[PDB]
Amino acid sequence: SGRLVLRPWIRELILGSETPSSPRAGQLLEVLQDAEAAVAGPSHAPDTSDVGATLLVSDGTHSVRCLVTREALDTSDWEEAEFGFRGTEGRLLLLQDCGVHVQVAEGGAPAEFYLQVDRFSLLPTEQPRLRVPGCNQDLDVQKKLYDCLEE
């Protein structure tokens, strides 16, 4: 009887000149770097609890790299969910609190826009993952990138 649909928002957000007042839904395509929960007590096992998750998130039209901040990870309750993002690819993901940031060129990779997520929720919806260009491949985004760099 129809299907409910999410509006694309990534390109519009970056090109738009203010921070998002509203929460945005997007699909998790890939986990580039996953996160580990903070385990109290001294131990010889490595501690990576000071590092957030890094995801590739799609909106149906473009993808974007998202840095899920430690603050966002530690404030979420992981109810019936192993801590971290692997296994959840293809899931919908609600970015409730986030901002557009510029990453300058570094370690062989050119500059780009990316999102920093300070609050999020997984929705239960899972769905096929579709090939999608990066938002940084867009011409209007590229132009705005090089505007931002010059400052």
Side-chain angles (χ1 to χ4, degrees):
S1 209
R3 276 255 206 76
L4 296 176
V5 143
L6 302 176
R7 288 267 161 277
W9 53 269
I10 292 162
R11 197 185 99 106
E12 190 169 46
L13 178 53
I14 291 169
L15 298 172
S17 63
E18 70 287 353
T19 48
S21 306
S22 48
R24 296 288 182 179
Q27 187 184 40
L28 173 57
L29 289 192
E30 184 170 25
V31 192
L32 306 174
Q33 185 66 76
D34 205 338
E36 167 219 301
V39 166
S43 85
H44 292 293
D47 180 49
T48 59
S49 59
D50 56 326
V51 192
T54 300
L55 312 176
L56 182 64
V57 166
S58 170
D59 71 357
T61 303
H62 299 96
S63 55
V64 67
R65 179 179 121 246
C66 297
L67 177 46
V68 185
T69 288
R70 211 61 229 202
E71 189 210 296
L73 289 177
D74 300 318
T75 66
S76 291
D77 81 302
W78 296 86
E79 207 70 12
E80 291 295 332
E82 179 209 273
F83 188 101
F85 284 106
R86 281 179 313 168
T88 75
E89 304 88 349
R91 290 279 293 286
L92 289 203
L93 182 67
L94 191 76
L95 313 183
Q96 289 154 307
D97 205 286
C98 74
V100 177
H101 294 270
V102 178
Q103 175 62 65
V104 302
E106 173 190 63
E112 59 171 80
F113 283 112
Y114 75 98
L115 299 181
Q116 183 180 309
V117 180
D118 282 300
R119 215 182 99 219
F120 79 91
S121 304
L122 262 76
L123 311 188
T125 299
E126 176 167 21
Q127 209 199 322
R129 293 171 312 119
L130 194 60
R131 250 277 152 195
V132 153
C135 65
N136 281 285
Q137 303 317 312
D138 185 81
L139 193 70
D140 285 309
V141 175
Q142 286 165 1
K143 286 178 179 178
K144 189 175 170 155
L145 181 53
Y146 275 50
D147 279 332
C148 299
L149 286 182
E150 304 278 343
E151 257 143 50

